[PDB]
Amino acid sequence: GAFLDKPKMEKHNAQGQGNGLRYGLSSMQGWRVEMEDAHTAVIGLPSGLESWSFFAVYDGHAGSQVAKYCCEHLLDHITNNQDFKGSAGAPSVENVKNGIRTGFLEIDEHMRVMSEKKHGADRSGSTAVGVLISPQHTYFINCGDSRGLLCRNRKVHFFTQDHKPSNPLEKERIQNAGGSVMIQRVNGSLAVSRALGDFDYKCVHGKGPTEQLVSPEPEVHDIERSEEDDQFIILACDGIWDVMGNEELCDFVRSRLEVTDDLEKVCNEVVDTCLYKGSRDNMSVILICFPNAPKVSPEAVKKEAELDKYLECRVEEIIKGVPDLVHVMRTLASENIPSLPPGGELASKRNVIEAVYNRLNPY
Ligand SMILES: [Mn+2]
Ligand SMILES: [Mn+2]
């Protein structure tokens, strides 16, 4: 219904280390009147999965109720059901894969009875994307238009495929549940074809839970882990992916990692870069790095210090009229400056340019 007059750019961070992993996250409200994103980051899991980890981004719609309940409870719905536990020993590929499906369906029904019982007024829904990381497998999980990727060996090794209504199997399901896809939207309103919650979209008679207008069924992919080649995993809501592609962001994160090992800082840079590339949505990013994540380079740090200083001089020189920040950005862009961060471009450097603009024209 509304945007803010000015963006809420305050970042919320977390970070941790364990099972050979390091992780950082950053969430920001941005231009939207509410923050309806949520996340989960836990290293070491209950009930004998000490050496497992779990990370997840939740993009909530029509309120944050569903997103928040998921962020605190999706994991135990996933690991504490007979499908995940099942077979006598350690959980197999199938156990894990079926366990997540059950987890997804059962928490959905759980939330439906809770809402029915307590007479809930919110009509919210949420995407989930994440990884369950075991000693030898990364299991990617997706439900909605949030997205995850694996950077392996300097390249995009795998990414999750967003559930858009106009996708062929999604459209088919929607049509069979008596709906249509109008442009990109389920009956002209809903932009996503899979989510937790959205219970009004889940009331077709004589169609299973996975056969409704909006499905809670996750897509799960088993990637075998690689001690030598596994570099980092990026999970983010569409607030990020709307304005940056797989290759770009993966190239950009690499560039940043070659400058800091501070993961919260890298995530802040993803989020600011995205706000400046024009994103007007809530943004949340998680960055999980593996032992062979890119390393800090003495040279890349110098190049960044050089580039920073260069951008400071241009600003000072561009001010002879006294142009506003917007106009300085325009001018700087039309200079076609070399060596800007890959993917990030000029946008990834606005905090540096702006801080300087302020040093010189503070009023
Ligand atoms: Mn949202
Ligand atoms: Mn969003």
Same domain, 51 and 144: yes
Distance CA 123, CA 36 (A): 13
What is the distance in A from the centroid of ligand 1 to the CA of 38? 9
Distance CA 79, CA 100 (A): 8
Specify whether the CB–CB gap between 80 and 47 falls below 8 A: yes
Identify the burial level of 325 via C-beta atoms within 10 angstroms of its C-beta, where 0-12 means exposed, 13-18 middle and 19 or more buried. Answer: middle
Distance CA 177, CA 8 (A): 40
Residue 44 dihedral angles phi and psi, to the nearest 5° = 85, 115
Distance CA 320, CA 18 (A): 53
Same domain, 18 and 109: yes
What is the distance in A from the centroid of ligand 1 to the CA of 66? 11
Specify whether the CB–CB gap between 217 and 210 falls below 8 A: yes
Nearest to 8 by CA among 33, 36, 26: 33
Same domain, 195 and 222: yes
What is the distance in A from the centroid of ligand 1 to the CA of 135? 32
H-type alpha helices, 48-153: 65-79, 82-85, 93-118
What is the distance in A from the centroid of ligand 2 to the CA of 59? 6
| Contacts of 299-308 spanning 24+ positions with Cβ under 8 A | 300/255, 300/258, 300/259, 301/259, 303/339, 304/259, 307/339, 307/340, 307/349, 308/352
Distance CA 142, CA 21 (A): 21
Q: Which ligand is nearest to the CA of 145?
A: 2
Distance CA 163, CA 144 (A): 5
Query: What proportions of the chain, in percent to the nearest 5, are helix, strand and coil?
Result: 35, 30, 35
HEC profile for 233-269?
Answer: EEEECHHHHCCCCHHHHHHHHHHHHCCCCCHHHHHHH
Among 275, 294, 313, residue at a domain's last position? 294
Distance CA 171, CA 194 (A): 11
Residue numbering of the annotated binding site for Mn(2+): 59-60, 238, 281
Q: What are residue 53's DSSP bridge partners?
A: 43, 133
Structure tokens at 11: 């970042």
Same domain, 329 and 203: no
Residue numbering of the annotated binding site: 59-60, 238, 281
Among 263, 294, 325, residue at a domain's last position? 294
Structure tokens at 339: 């060596």
Specify whether the CB–CB gap between 40 and 26 falls below 8 A: no
Distance CA 108, CA 178 (A): 22
Q: What are residue 17's DSSP bridge partners?
A: 22
What is the distance in A from the centroid of ligand 2 to the CA of 206? 31
Residue partners of 169: CB distance under 8 A and separation at least 6 = none
Q: What are residue 59's DSSP bridge partners?
A: 37, 127
How many C-alpha atoms does 339 have within 13 Å on its Cβ side?
11
What is the distance in A from the centroid of ligand 1 to the CA of 36? 5
For residue 320, what is the domain's CATH number?
1.10.10.430
Question: To what resolution in angstroms was this structure determined?
Answer: 2.5
Residues in the chain: 363
Radius of gyration (C-alpha) of the chain in whole angstroms:
22
Same domain, 169 and 307: no
HEC profile for 168-217?
Answer: HHHHHHHHHCCCCEECCEECCCECCCECEECHHHCCCCCCCHHHCCCECC
Q: Which ligand is nearest to the CA of 197?
A: 1
What is the distance in A from the centroid of ligand 1 to the CA of 141? 18
Domain extent for 324:
295-363
Distance CA 235, CA 283 (A): 11
Q: What one-character DSSP code corresponds to residue 294?
A: P
Same domain, 214 and 280: yes
**CB atoms near residue 239 (< 10 Å):** 26
Specify whether the CB–CB gap between 236 and 283 falls below 8 A: yes
Residue 98 DSSP SS3? helix
Nearest to 55 by CA among 83, 22, 98, 87: 22
**CB atoms near residue 157 (< 10 Å):** 18
Q: What are residue 259's DSSP bridge partners?
A: none
Among 253, 274, 294, residue at a domain's last position? 294
Domain count, the chain: 2
Structure tokens at 104: 């997804």
Experimental approach was X-ray
Same domain, 279 and 358: no
**CB atoms near residue 131 (< 10 Å):** 23
What is the distance in A from the centroid of ligand 1 to the CA of 59? 5
Same domain, 130 and 238: yes
Same domain, 306 and 274: no
Beta strands 181-182 and 185-186, pairing class: antiparallel
Specify whether the CB–CB gap between 8 and 27 falls below 8 A: no
Distance CA 4, CA 91 (A): 47
Same domain, 305 and 158: no
Residue 17 DSSP SS3? strand
Same domain, 213 and 328: no
Same domain, 194 and 323: no
